[PDB]
Structure formats: C-alpha cells, structure tokens
Design a protein around this nucleic acid. Structure first.
Ligand code: 0L3
Ligand code: MG
Ligand code: MG
Ligand code: MG
Ligand code: MG
Ligand code: MG
Length: 539
DNA sequence: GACCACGGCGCC
DNA sequence: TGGCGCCGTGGTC
C-alpha cells in the first residue's frame, strides 16, 4: 500500500494494537488506517483517535470501548469478524478468520488496517446472495456491537468492602471444613487436588468409585459422584461443603474486588460477540454471566452487585424462553396452546418432581425443574433421569414418553432438523443463523449422538439468542433517551441501571420492548424487577 | 511468568 | 441434555 500521512479520509478501515486483550485496561500502542490503496500510520495513537468518525475493521468494538473509556464517542462500524462469524460460528478469532479469508493477523497496526480492508471486501463478497445472513448483519450483529461497546465501557458498581469482609468470614469456615476432612482422612493432603482426593476416597478409605473422568479415565470425584456417597461416609458431606465455599471464594469473592477500574470505580466485563457456536454472547475478563445465585452464599455474592447512588437496577428475564421458541419452530398445536393459556411447564414439572401443589413450588424447586425439562428435551437418557430424580427406570421412561406424546410435532421437528443437518451439513435458527455440525454422520454412536444433540439444540438456543440480541438493539436507543444504562446481559436476562425517578418508567418500557421485539406463534412474557442490588432486583 | 490440558463447577 | 469461562492442579516451557 502507498504510505500517506495521518489522518485518513472518512470510512477508512482501522488497525490497532493493544498492550493487553481487555480494551478497558489496554494501552493503545499503535493506530492506523487503510483506504483507496493508501495506508495511514498515526504518529501518536491517542491523539489520532479523535480524527476517526467510526471504528471500522477487525475487532471494531474493542477500539470503540477504549475510545469511550477516553471520553470519545467513537461507534464501531463494519467488522469482518462479524461477517465471518455469520458464515460460520467456528470463525471466532482474528487469526483464524484472516488465514481463512485472505491474510495474516500480525502485530502491526498498519498491516491490521490493510488486513481489515481486504477481509471485508472478500467476506462481503461471500455474503452476496445470502440475504438472511445479510439481514442478521445489518439488523442484529453490526448495531449490537455498538450497544455492547457502551455496556463494556459503562461497567457495574460492586460493593468491594462487603466482599473483602465476606472473604475473611468464608476463610474461617473453609478452615473448619478442611480440618475435619484431614481428620477423617487420618492425614492432611492437598484438598484442592482431585488426584490426591481420589486416592484418599477410593484407595485409602473404603468408598467405591461410581464413575470415570471423560478424558483421562480416572475415578471421578465430581459432585454427582459425591452426592450418591453422602450417606456412605461423613467426609463426603464436608468435601462437598468445602468445594462450594472454595469455588465461590476463589472465583468470585477474592478476585472481583481487585478488578475495579481506577477511573470509573466500576467493574468492567467483556461481551464477546463471536465466541459461541449457537449465536449466544459470552462474557469474560471477568465472566459476569456466571455470578452465583443458587446457594445462600452465592446469593450474598450476587447482592454485592449494586446500583450507583441515586440509581436503581432493573432486571428483566424472559419466561421459559426456549420452550416458547420450541413451540414456534415445531409449530406444535398443543405446546402453542399451553402458552396461549398462560401455563408454566417449569412449575408443573416441579410439582410433579417433589409431589407438591403448585403453590408449594419455590424458586429453588423451579430451578431443579429446568434441568429436567431442558435435559429431557435435549436428549437426556432415561437412565440419567432415573438417577437425577432417584426414581425407578420405568417411571423415568414414563416421563420421557409422556413428554413427547403431548407434543407430537416436537419429535417430528427434531427429526426434520437432523436430516436437513446431515444433508446440508448445517442447521439454522429462525432467522437463518447457521451452525455446521459435520459429526452427524459419524461412525461411533456416542460421537454421532452427541453431535445430534448439539445439532437440534442450536436452532432453539440460537433463536432465543437472536431474539435477545434484537431486543437489545431496539432497547438501547430508548434507554439513552431516558438517561438509563444497559449494564449486563445473561443470555435471556438484561440488567439495566436507571435514575430512581425514571426507574419505574424504564422497567415498563424495557418489558414492552422485549415482549414485542419479534412476535412468535406464542406470546413472549418478561418478568421485571427493580432494586438496589442484582438479587433484590429479581425478588 | 507463560501456555496447555484437565477435572470440576459457576451461570443461562 | 445443550451453551459458555475460570478456578487450581499438574506438567511443561
Ligand atoms: N440445564 C440447562 N440445560 C439446557 N438449557 C438450559 C439449562 C438452563 C438452566 C438452568 C438452571 C438454572 C436456571 N436459572 C434459575 O433457575 C434461576 C432463576 C432465578 C431468577 C428468575 C428470574 C425470573 C423471576 C420471575 O419471578 C437454562 N437453559 C436455557 C433454556 C432457557 O430457556 C434459557 C434461559 O433459562 P432461564 O431464564 O434460567 O429459564 P427459563 O427462561 O426457561 O424460565 P424462566 O425461569 O421463566 O426464565 O437457557
Ligand atoms: Mg487490574
Ligand atoms: Mg428466563
Ligand atoms: Mg434467565
Ligand atoms: Mg403486549
Ligand atoms: Mg474444559
């Protein structure tokens, strides 16, 4: 390319180098742009950032996040990563995408800008004729990148002192559990090592090994294994209690307070737009899509996520989203009627499991019912179902045959999806987002059947993801008009932050937007809550 | 310090 | 059952 002085003309493709992967923590080492056979290298990256009208190119969102961090309203535009990801969700990295579509992902800004230009040209050519994928790009992925950029740059408030105090409390309880475990074992060892624990439980002690690890074929010390050994030895209960506490402390309680940004005073995650095979987003550095909520201690951690002073959090969650999506995709008359009548499968399944009335079903019980409903739907064996519910094989078998007898179009839709997946080499969501599943015709039954479960799950999980993405795109400008913020997304959940005076209005509006984003054969219902913290904003 | 693989497990 | 990312361990570089 012909070397030309900064700045570049409008609509140029940008290239940039960061000191680290996280845009909120990165130092902009270099900045460059490419257009019309020319390449423009910035003398000073930060200053040159102001000359750009938009971030157009590879990893456009990340540069936009860094710009927002610096108080610059620099929206992300075209990004070859998004084009490639729509063609094939296995296109997750700039290294892979570059190699596959015409170039190399180097560590020089000028070359990255030149790469972005060429990749866009080729990938745009690949999307020609693909109207449905083009629609997803223009209407979903590209505008969503802007929304995500704001979310990442905004961050969430965290009660640091609360967590640091909690750490000291948990540490003492952990000490009590490990002391008991070492006594029961008759000797101390590394309780954090599953290899050492395996020897203690199965060799040294008398406990029998139930299962094996997937990859190394060693005797498993997993939860499911320990759950069945709870009455065989008192050490098992202690190990399980130790597991939970150390898990939460090492993953959440301890590292999270150390990640508060010195300028924003808030916690900043990354929403990865090209990281899953189904079309879902992912969250990392840190992951804020797996903050605990099940156990009492997990709930205490959840409460540490709070609203800014003078603000309130608004939490919105789609009701039974993937079941409703299933009703639309399969076109099952009965399943459609279930939601038209306003029934709840999760509640009904829970009442059956625990043998209680519908009014007796609590959130924890309803949570367990989700494992059953989605598990059975996505091909859980009758053997495991019997084990999960501690029931005979016939009863578990009776539940699955009953599960599909009510909705005949479901099994039919699954089989249709599978055949089409084998023939075309891919399956697709309602909007046409595709996933290539080549192991549908594998020799090995375990490999082939696993691929099948991946295959017919994607149109359901992916469509729900498409719906949520579309809702976020529509909702965001409405929130900016009201002075509200979009903070987090948890697959079918949205967490907003609104000024107290407008909190109620924002909640109503956001509920309406999500419910009416893209109507199906069944209505979409959204549960909404408001509160000072994430947990309270749900209850 | 870094990467990887692995078991394990947090959430949807 | 599916979809993720992060923990410590173990091994390595
Ligand atoms: N085990 C699985 N296997 C396969 N797929 C799974 C799952 C799975 C799960 C799980 C266990 C934990 C789920 N979450 C809870 O039970 C805690 C929810 C508390 C907050 C409730 C918010 C609404 C409040 C209403 O008052 C979710 N999914 C998929 C399928 C779901 O449709 C989608 C979103 O899950 P959720 O929102 O948790 O459950 P649903 O939306 O189906 O029901 P909802 O509870 O009415 O929202 O994610
Ligand atoms: Mg830091
Ligand atoms: Mg939901
Ligand atoms: Mg949810
Ligand atoms: Mg309505
Ligand atoms: Mg793994």
């Amino acid at each position: 390319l012909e070397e030309a002085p900064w700045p570049p003309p409008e609509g140029a493709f940008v290239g940039f180098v960061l000191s680290r992967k996280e845009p909120m923590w990165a130092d902009l080492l270099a900045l460059a742009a490419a257009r019309g056979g020319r390449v423009h290298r910035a003398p000073e990256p930060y200053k040159a950032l102001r000359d750009l009208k938009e971030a157009r190119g590879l990893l456009a969102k990340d540069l936009s996040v860094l710009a927002l961090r610096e108080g610059l309203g620099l929206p992300p535009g075209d990004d070859p990563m998004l084009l490639a990801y729509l063609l094939d969700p296995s296109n997750t990295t700039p290294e892979g995408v570059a190699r596959r579509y015409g170039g190399e992902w180097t560590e020089e800004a000028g070359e990255r800008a030149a790469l972005s230009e060429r990749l866009f040209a080729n990938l745009w050519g690949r999307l020609e004729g693909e109207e449905r994928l083009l629609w997803l790009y223009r209407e979903v992925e590209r505008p969503l990148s802007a929304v995500l950029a704001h979310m990442e740059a905004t961050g969430v408030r965290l009660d640091v002192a609360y967590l640091r105090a909690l750490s000291l409390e948990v540490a003492e309880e952990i000490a009590r559990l490990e002391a008991e475990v070492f006594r029961l074992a008759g000797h101390p060892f590394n309780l954090n090592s599953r290899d050492q624990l395996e020897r203690v439980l199965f060799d040294e002690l008398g406990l029998p090994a139930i299962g094996k690890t997937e990859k190394t074929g060693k005797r498993s010390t997993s939860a499911a294994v320990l759950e069945a050994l709870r009455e065989a030895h008192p050490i098992v209960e202690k190990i399980l209690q130790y597991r939970e506490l150390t898990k939460l402390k090492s993953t959440y309680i301890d590292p999270l307070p150390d990640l508060i940004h010195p300028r924003t005073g808030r916690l900043h995650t990354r929403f990865n737009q090209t990281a899953t095979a189904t079309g879902r987003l992912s969250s990392s550095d840190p992951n804020l899509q797996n903050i605990p909520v099940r156990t009492p201690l997990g709930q205490r951690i959840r409460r540490a996520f709070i609203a800014e002073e003078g603000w309130l959090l608004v939490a919105l969650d789609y009701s039974q989203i993937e079941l409703r999506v299933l009703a639309h995709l399969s076109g099952d008359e009965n399943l459609i009627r279930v939601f038209q009548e306003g029934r709840d499968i999760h509640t009904e399944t829970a009442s059956w499991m625990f043998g209680v009335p519908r009014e007796a079903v609590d959130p924890l019980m309803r949570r367990a019912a989700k494992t059953i409903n989605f598990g059975v739907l996505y091909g859980m064996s009758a053997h495991r179902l019997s084990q999960e519910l501690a029931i005979p094989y016939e009863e578990a078998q009776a539940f699955i045959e009953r599960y599909f007898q009510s909705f005949p179009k479901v099994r039919a839709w699954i089989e249709k999806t599978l055949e089409e997946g084998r023939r075309r080499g891919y399956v697709e969501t309602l909007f046409g987002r595709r996933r290539y599943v080549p192991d549908l015709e594998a020799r090995v039954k375990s490999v082939r059947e696993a691929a099948e479960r991946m295959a017919f799950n994607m149109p359901v999980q992916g469509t729900a993801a498409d719906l949520m993405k579309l809702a976020m795109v529509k909702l965001f400008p409405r929130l900016e008009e009201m002075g509200a913020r979009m903070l987090l997304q948890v697959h079918d959940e949205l967490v907003l932050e609104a000024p107290k005076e407008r909190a109620e209005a924002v909640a109503r509006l956001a509920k309406e937007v999500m419910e009416g984003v893209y109507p199906l054969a069944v209505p979409l219902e959204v549960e909404v809550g408001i509160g000072e913290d994430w947990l309270s904003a749900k209850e």
